Each structure stands twice: as C-alpha cells, then as structure tokens.
RNA sequence: AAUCCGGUUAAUAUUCCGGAACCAGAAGGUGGAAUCAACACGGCAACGUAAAUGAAGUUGGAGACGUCGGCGGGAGCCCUGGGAAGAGUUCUCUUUUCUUUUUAACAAACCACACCCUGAAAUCGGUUUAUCCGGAGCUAGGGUAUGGUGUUUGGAAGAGUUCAGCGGCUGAAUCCGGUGCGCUCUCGACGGCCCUUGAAAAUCCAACGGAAGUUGUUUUCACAUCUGGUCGUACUCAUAACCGCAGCAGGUCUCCAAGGUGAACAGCCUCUAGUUGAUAGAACAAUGUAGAUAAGGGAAGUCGGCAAAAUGGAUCCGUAACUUCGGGAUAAGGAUUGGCUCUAAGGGUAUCAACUUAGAACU
C-alpha cells in the first residue's frame, strides 16, 4: 500500500534494481556464458513475498 | 495519430470530462505536436480544443406537470401508490394542527380570553376537539358569550 | 487577517519595523483598501473617502514600499 | 423609465433587415402581460435614425427578451448563419457577422 | 497541538508556487497592569473585565463514550421568482430551453433548555408532536451564562467563473431574493429500552491550601523575535494492477450520492462523470439454453400441481372458526382507480407561502 515501512521500500528498491535486463557489453566478454537475466520477475506473475 | 494523452490533458485543463472535450478533427497534426499543459492551453486559446456544452436535461415537462398537480391533477385513486399515512403522515398533520391551535390560543390570551379559559381551551385542544382553526374560533365565540 | 478602523493606527503599524510592504487597492465602488504586510498579519484599512485616501498615501513613510493594485 | 437599443447599422447598410420589419415584428410579438398589441404607454418603440430600434419601457422588461425577439425573425428570414446578436453595453444590442 | 484557498507538472500536492494563517517550545525586549492600604476592581446576585504572585500537599473536571425514536436549528444539496451574459430551438408555439452566476481556513464584532433577582401562586396555572413543572418559589418581569457550519466586515476579488474584442493585453458581468413532513451531515433539547447501564491512559485546565516574597517585586495581558527532526506520500483498490495457477461471471472493509415517476437508496428513464470493453462475419436445419403465446377442456399429467399460470399498489366496505385475548387478519369476500374543467375545505402577516384530502360534472 501507500503506507510502507522503510524496510519494505529498501527491499522493493533492490527488487526493482535486480529486475532489469543485462548490460550488452557483458555479452561480448571473453569466456562469457551469460546471455539473458535468468532471475527476471514480473509484478503479476511472481510475487516478492516479503 | 494517438491523441489520448492530449485528451487527458485537455480534460484536466478545461475542468471537465473527456466526454466533454472536443478537438478539431482537421488539426490533428498540430494537436499531436501539443504535448504539455502550456501547449494545450494555447490550443484552447486558439479554439482548436473546445469544452462542449452539457447534454439537454430541460425541466419543462416537469414544471408543467407540477403546475398541473397543484391545481389537483394526477392525484386520484389510480395515482396513489403509497398509503395515506405514507403520502401524508397523520403525525405531521396533528403536530401542525396543535401548533396552529396553540399559537392562536395564546394569541387570544395576550390580546385579551383569560388564563382560565386558555387553560380549559388547551386541554380540550389537546383532547382532539377543535378540528381546525375555524372550529376553535367558533367555540371561543360561543364561549363567554353564553356566559356574559 | 486583521481589519483596522483607525487611520493613525495604520500609520503607527506602518511606522513599526515589522511592516514590510503596502498595497493600495482601488475598488469599483470608489473605495480604497490600504493593506500593510507585517510579520504576523495583513492589516487592512478600508477608506471610503477619496481625499482621506491620498493624504494617507502621502502620509505613509517614504521608506515603506507602496504598490499599485 | 428603462431604455433599450437594438443596433442594426450593419443590417441597414447591407439591406439585411429593414426598419419596417423591425418595427412591425416587434410590435406584433412583444408579450406585455402575456398579450400582444397592448403596448400602451408602458412600452413604446420610438426609433431614432435609420440604424436604431429604441424601446422605452416603464416596467421590468428584459433585454434578453429583446434578444429573444431579434433572433426570432433572423431565423424567419433564414440568415441566422451569417448574423448573430451580441450585447455591447447596458441594454444595447447589435448584429454581428461571422 | 496546529493549514486554508487559488495556481502549478507528461507524471507530485492540505507536501511544491503565490497569498493568507495556525501550533508548540525558548529566551530576554517594548508597551501596559498590580504593589509602601504587599498580591486588581465592578455586579444585590447569577457573574463580568486586557492584565490581576501562589510552593509542597490534596481534590475536582475535561480527555471519556450505549442503542432507538420522533422534534427543533444550521450547512451543503435539491427546488424556485426576477436581472444579466452567452448557447440550443424557432412550419408554428414558447417574455423560454439550457449553461454561468462562486467565496476557504483564519481574524474581529455581534447574537435566547440551564442559573440569578424582585414576587408569592387554588376560580391552580405554565407548557411539548410526545405531561412534565411549580410554597424545595409557578406564571409574569428584569437579568447572567453558554455562542457557530449564524449575521456583519477583514481574507477578497486582485481569485475563480462566464462573455466581448485586440495582438500577452483591453472591456464588461460575476446581481436581488424566496421556499420545505425534501436529501446528506451536524447540533440542540427531549422521550424510550436493559436480570445488557454501554473502555482506559497519555495529555490539559481548575480549585482548596498559604510556602515564599524612592526602590524593587510580580504580570495565565497586548505586542514584536527564533525554531520545528525521522519515516510513509507515484499508481491500482478491482468484470485486468489484491486473493483464487490467469487480464477467472468467484471473493474482499468503507466515504461522497443529481432529476422525474413512486411510499421508497424499489424498478424504469435521464444529468455530471465513465464506458462503448467481452474473436468476428454470413446464414436461419434438427436438438438445445433463455424467454413469449395458444382454440376447447382444466390436473385427465405426475410418486407428488414439479414447473408455469393466476393473485398483487392504493382507497372504501366487509371479515369466520379458534385463541394464551395479544392475535388470527391483507382472513375470507366485494366495489373503486384515466384525462380534463371546476369548486370545497385545511395555514402565515388587505396580502403571501404550500401539497393533502373530499366531491361535482364533462370526456
């Protein structure tokens, strides 16, 4: 809700930052085996459960 | 192409609903260029965005039928859907009656019936007698005249 | 806001250091309102007479900032 | 007492409506006390110059009603599209094009 | 404890902007007030006044309270008579149909069930819609208190709104009233109900008490002066943002609530606002789902009147057995209902305001 605790907003802020696509220059590195973010989340599909 | 953002801005600026917002359909290119509230205000100033008048809700028929109903129209047994108590409560009728009788009653006392007559004609007025102001008047006229 | 019914009170409050600015408001009924912005209140004097209006306006201290409608 | 003007200087310049239509239509359809033809001394139309329509009424009688009656015969003469009634001053109306 | 209005963004506002306030805390300063008759006066009184020292201790109040029912007041809304601006309509009719007519917190002044004073009341009076009150002082008369969501002004018209021009600017208007068994909220004074009597505390104020105490003392008085941290604040709150595996016909607390019909927050229709979303197109075969109707008969159908039909509002008349006397009861049975033109009553100060019943014709 609008009424949040500071602890909740911190966890939500980190969840937002982790819910981003991968930088493109990561994909060009030597020995790179990472192509797409395998930990992506959508707000309807998976819930954060905090 | 898309003018949904422009319509929401226009409704907010014009202080009306998006149903009341009108955009000149021949100025889509310039309206689409307008992307801020300053731009929308300029469009409203230029006349390219107009707040349309409300829909018509005239009370002419309502006023006419209420003018008919005060003369005694549309008030028969085929028009009464509520009970007599529902359409006019007897509690209101008697409360109005008691106030009318008592106001006239003390008016005559201050004018010059006395305390004894006012006290008799009051318990009697509370006792369902004096069905209207005129009936109380005639009782007052016959009272103290048969005595004098 | 405060209403002042005395002209010399208006001058005295204007003389007081808390006065910051003054507004002269000319209404459509030829009645002027002399408003004085202080630290705590907007002091307003309603002068309905024209001749008392401008003698008061020239009576206001020169250091005070007087502003048109 | 109260005094009203309906300016039609543009109309008389362009032969849009003439004085005769103005005067007769006003006289015929001024609803004084719910009736026409009872103007009397209370409401008198006394035009000055061939550009005015002056109405002097001794009773409450609204300029909106003047604007009402004006718009009536502009519709009758079927050029309401190119002519509209606009108020300029207190109790004075006049005719405007597009 | 204490914030309002207008404005502002693509997205934030009681938070920003403009304007206007308010609260708490702190220090001393200025002006006034008390005091060598130390800690003010007036009023018969209720109590009033800009002030008007009050420690420890004690005590009191506020905070702080159910539910129902009508009654009265206010506010907004609804409604309404004129004026003014535009707009719709105009074969004809309509001095009309519609829209716009706005005023916040805050600040000041103003404003009558309880109480007081004189006076003593039975031929008892006063009085509410509702029967309570009075020799424990009625009525009456004169006072005191309580005092806004009231009035008047400041805020504040410069704002907002509506219109007419000009190339941001210039002109106008933003007016004067009514009404009520109306609606929502609220307030007041009451009535009913209980083997039910319907929180606490933080905070705040007061009293009793009398410690201390020419300058000096005090001063809950009017003024200026400074300050106000931390976190929440977007958006959804649901026939797509929540939970049901989902953009699921399910579920999920609550606030605001226009007009007509009508008893009604019913149903039906409309104004503001919102939406026009749910694979579409063309065809009308059987069967089906969902609605309708049917001659004559009228439960013969069926385990069973299952489903359907029938009845239905209001007014008037009439109403059995039985009964725990309260009911049964809308028992059962009858009649009546439109439109229109009229009168007849029912209120307020010659005149105004308001739907509510009784008829009478005519159709």
From Swiss-Prot, chain A:
Similarity annotation: Belongs to the eukaryotic ribosomal protein eL39 family.
GO CC aspect terms: cytosolic large ribosomal subunit; preribosome
Keywords for this protein: Cytoplasm, Ribonucleoprotein, Ribosomal protein
Keyword check for Ribosomal protein: yes
Basic residues compositional bias, start-end: 1-14
One GO BP: cytoplasmic translation
Domain of life: Eukaryota
Protein name (record): Large ribosomal subunit protein eL39
Role description: Component of the ribosome, a large ribonucleoprotein complex responsible for the synthesis of proteins in the cell. The small ribosomal subunit (SSU) binds messenger RNAs (mRNAs) and translates the encoded message by selecting cognate aminoacyl-transfer RNA (tRNA) molecules. The large subunit (LSU) contains the ribosomal catalytic site termed the peptidyl transferase center (PTC), which catalyzes the formation of peptide bonds, thereby polymerizing the amino acids delivered by tRNAs into a polypeptide chain.
Subunit field text: Component of the large ribosomal subunit (LSU). Mature yeast ribosomes consist of a small (40S) and a large (60S) subunit. The 40S small subunit contains 1 molecule of ribosomal RNA (18S rRNA) and at least 33 different proteins. The large 60S subunit contains 3 rRNA molecules (25S, 5.8S and 5S rRNA) and at least 46 different proteins. eL39 interacts with yih1.
Keyword Ribosomal protein attributed: yes
Renumbered residue ranges of the record's region Disordered: 1-20
Cellular compartments annotated: Cytoplasm
Organism this protein belongs to: Schizosaccharomyces pombe (strain 972 / ATCC 24843)
GO MF entry, a single one: structural constituent of ribosome
UniProtKB/Swiss-Prot annotation, chain B:
GO molecular function, one term: structural constituent of ribosome
UniProt keyword list: Cytoplasm, Ribonucleoprotein, Ribosomal protein
Highest taxon, organism lineage: Eukaryota
GO CC aspect terms: cytosol; cytosolic large ribosomal subunit; preribosome
GO BP annotations, alphabetical order: cytoplasmic translation
Predominant place of localization: cytoplasm
Compartmental location: Cytoplasm
Similarity-based family: Belongs to the eukaryotic ribosomal protein eL19 family.
Further information: There are 2 genes for eL19 in S.pombe.
Function: Component of the ribosome, a large ribonucleoprotein complex responsible for the synthesis of proteins in the cell. The small ribosomal subunit (SSU) binds messenger RNAs (mRNAs) and translates the encoded message by selecting cognate aminoacyl-transfer RNA (tRNA) molecules. The large subunit (LSU) contains the ribosomal catalytic site termed the peptidyl transferase center (PTC), which catalyzes the formation of peptide bonds, thereby polymerizing the amino acids delivered by tRNAs into a polypeptide chain.
Subunit structure: Component of the large ribosomal subunit (LSU). Mature yeast ribosomes consist of a small (40S) and a large (60S) subunit. The 40S small subunit contains 1 molecule of ribosomal RNA (18S rRNA) and at least 33 different proteins. The large 60S subunit contains 3 rRNA molecules (25S, 5.8S and 5S rRNA) and at least 46 different proteins. eL19 lies in close proximity to the binding site for eukaryotic initiation factor eIF4G.
Name of the gene this protein is made from: rpl1901
Entire protein: shown range: 2 to 150 of 193
UniProtKB/Swiss-Prot annotation, chain C:
Organism superkingdom: Eukaryota
Intracellular or extracellular location(s): Cytoplasm
GO terms for cellular component: cytosol; cytosolic large ribosomal subunit; preribosome
Keywords: Cytoplasm, Ribonucleoprotein, Ribosomal protein
Keyword Ribosomal protein recorded: yes
GO biological process entries: cytoplasmic translation; protein-RNA complex assembly
Cited function: Component of the ribosome, a large ribonucleoprotein complex responsible for the synthesis of proteins in the cell. The small ribosomal subunit (SSU) binds messenger RNAs (mRNAs) and translates the encoded message by selecting cognate aminoacyl-transfer RNA (tRNA) molecules. The large subunit (LSU) contains the ribosomal catalytic site termed the peptidyl transferase center (PTC), which catalyzes the formation of peptide bonds, thereby polymerizing the amino acids delivered by tRNAs into a polypeptide chain.
Miscellaneous notes: There are 2 genes for eL38 in S.pombe.
Family: Belongs to the eukaryotic ribosomal protein eL38 family.
Protein name: Large ribosomal subunit protein eL38A
Annotated organism of origin: Schizosaccharomyces pombe (strain 972 / ATCC 24843) (Fission yeast)
Swiss-Prot record, chain D:
An MF annotation (GO) of this entry: structural constituent of ribosome
GO biological process: cytoplasmic translation
Compartments, record wording: Cytoplasm; Nucleus, Nucleolus
Record-listed Phosphoserine modification sites: 41-42
GO cellular component: cytosol; cytosolic large ribosomal subunit; nucleolus; preribosome
UniProt entry keywords in alphabetical sequence: Cytoplasm, Nucleus, Phosphoprotein, Ribonucleoprotein, Ribosomal protein
Family: Belongs to the eukaryotic ribosomal protein eL22 family.
Its job: Component of the ribosome, a large ribonucleoprotein complex responsible for the synthesis of proteins in the cell. The small ribosomal subunit (SSU) binds messenger RNAs (mRNAs) and translates the encoded message by selecting cognate aminoacyl-transfer RNA (tRNA) molecules. The large subunit (LSU) contains the ribosomal catalytic site termed the peptidyl transferase center (PTC), which catalyzes the formation of peptide bonds, thereby polymerizing the amino acids delivered by tRNAs into a polypeptide chain.
Subunit structure: Component of the large ribosomal subunit (LSU). Mature yeast ribosomes consist of a small (40S) and a large (60S) subunit. The 40S small subunit contains 1 molecule of ribosomal RNA (18S rRNA) and at least 33 different proteins. The large 60S subunit contains 3 rRNA molecules (25S, 5.8S and 5S rRNA) and at least 46 different proteins.
Protein name: Large ribosomal subunit protein eL22
Species name: Schizosaccharomyces pombe (strain 972 / ATCC 24843) (Fission yeast)
